[PDB]
């Protein structure tokens, strides 16, 4: 059932799937394009065919408690599909949503420069943009931010909240104003 | 309800608590003994008061998805209690048995020698432990197994396994026998 996971690009993600029939047994993971990452094959963990391959992963520590994660570390906002989780007979289907939030100016700015954050997104996200300045200043966005010119005060960590559904991803860049 | 989880000695665990109410919610873990180890406070994590204080976690990362582990790092076998997963209305009840497994000898004996593997636990435990060869042979034990005198060939990483209730820890330690 319609679980999501929002994501961030680099950052680390786990997917949650639980069986709960007797303890301990056969589970499978694929992506919604029908091609498998991972199962537990006999008391080994195969990782069939995929872009991911050198990089999926589950705890087998906990497979004895029905847990069948999906670990998918160092995330491409590619990444961004439908995975299913498979217990004997049932699905579990969660969406990661992988994003990514630049500078494409820098932090290291001066008094009177303007400012440009741009989020990077997989396509069919219908994010809002919400970022907060050090000194606690809203600025709404689309896929592109933009600060006129910011001045002295607002040097500090600044907070971003990609907010799409319940489930939001906020972010912290730390900018530097001069003069 | 009763889902056991036995650990080792050193090594990390981790307890299953699932939720699967609206998605992000407040829990609570607390040993039989009633005393809290955690619980979210808010959007806070709070670590009452406890010997594992120090020593406890969970995954904020997850609590999205319903998810509120319980995280005991470098176990005791004492920290061999009850806890209990509390999420609004409802209660999980799982049980960690601490396992370690000496060599009240070493690794570095001499052909002729005898060996004695001890089996550390808490009380309440009533494992059966089978400890294989390096060239596969058994030897069946209570809280104490010995080897005789080993002699050449059974140089190796023997395999212990304290078999308890379905879930079973099993044990690596590696021999050096000369002569």
Same mark, same amino acid.
Not at 34 to 38: D, V, Y
Not at 94 to 101: D, N, P, R, S
Not at 144 to 148: E, K, W
């Given at each position: 059932?319609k679980k999501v996971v929002?994501?961030?690009k680099?950052?680390t ?7 709960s029939?007797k303890?301990?047994?056969?589970f499978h993971?694929?992506?919604?394009n ?5 199962g537990?094959?006999g ?15 589950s705890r +087998?520590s906990?497979?004895? &408690? =029905?847990?069948?994660? $999906?670990?998918?570390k160092? /995330?491409?906002?590619? !990444?961004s599909d439908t ?19 630049t500078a494409?100016s ?16 997989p ?11 050090? +000194?606690?200043?809203?600025? &709404? =966005?689309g896929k592109? $931010?933009?600060?006129?010119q /910011?001045?002295?005060? !607002?040097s500090g ?5 990609v ?10 860049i730390d ?5």
């Open positions: 059932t929002l994501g961030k680099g950052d993600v786990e997917l949650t799937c639980t069986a029939q303890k301990s047994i056969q993971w694929k992506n919604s029908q091609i498998k990452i991972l537990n094959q008391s080994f963990l195969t990782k069939g065919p995929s872009k991911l391959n050198d990089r999926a992963d +087998r906990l497979w004895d &408690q =029905g847990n069948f994660p $999906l670990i998918i160092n /995330l491409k906002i590619e !990444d995975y299913i989780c498979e217990v004997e007979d049932q699905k579990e289907e969660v969406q990661l949503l992988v994003f990514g939030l494409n820098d932090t290291h700015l001066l008094q009177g420069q303007s400012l440009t954050l741009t989020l990077e997104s396509p069919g996200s219908s994010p809002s943009v919400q970022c907060r300045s050090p +000194r606690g200043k809203n600025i &709404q =966005g592109t $931010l933009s600060v006129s /910011l001045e002295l005060q !607002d960590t600044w907070t971003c909240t907010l799409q559904n319940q489930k939001k991803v906020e972010f912290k900018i530097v104003v001069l003069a």
